[PDB]
Design a protein around this ligand. Structure first.
Ligand SMILES: [Cl-]
Ligand SMILES: [Cl-]
Ligand SMILES: [Cl-]
Ligand SMILES: [Cl-]
Ligand SMILES: [Cl-]
Ligand SMILES: [Cl-]
Ligand SMILES: [Cl-]
Ligand code: NA
Length: 129
């Protein structure tokens, strides 16, 4: 599924991400925009053989099981395929664990490089939330 900007903001709010760990909804929408362009089915291989999955590009090195990332963990206790669903529940639940892990949203390098410190409220501007 390719979400619209306000459609995703609304789904993230429905699943309790808005202001989760103090990160406003615009932070989460911005992260999704630059990680996946709002596409739930986005997958990207990393140099080290791990793969990033879904709207928030969650990495098989730590968070999900894809069966092909040697020495990796599965801390969200999910198959990485669950992160590609049209329903964002699994991606949101897992993202809540990642952002709780100690470095907040810096875990998303695209968030640090493209969203952190910017006018992230623009991402939810005009949305009926
Ligand atoms: Cl957009
Ligand atoms: Cl915001
Ligand atoms: Cl594996
Ligand atoms: Cl594990
Ligand atoms: Cl699995
Ligand atoms: Cl959803
Ligand atoms: Cl933080
Ligand atoms: Na894994």
């Amino acid at each position: 599924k390719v979400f619209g900007r306000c459609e995703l903001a609304a789904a993230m709010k429905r699943h309790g991400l808005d202001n989760y760990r103090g990160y406003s909804l615009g932070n989460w929408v911005c992260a999704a925009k630059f990680e996946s362009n709002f596409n739930t089915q986005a997958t990207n291989r990393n140099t080290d053989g791990s793969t990033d999955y879904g709207i928030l590009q969650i990495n098989s090195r730590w968070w999900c099981n894809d069966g092909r990332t040697p020495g990796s963990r599965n801390l969200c206790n999910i198959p990485c395929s669950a992160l590609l669903s049209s329903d964002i529940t699994a991606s949101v639940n897992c993202a809540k664990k990642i952002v709780s892990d100690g470095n907040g949203m810096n875990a998303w390098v695209a968030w640090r490089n493209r969203c952190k410190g910017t006018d992230v409220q623009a991402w939810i501007r005009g949305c009926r939330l």
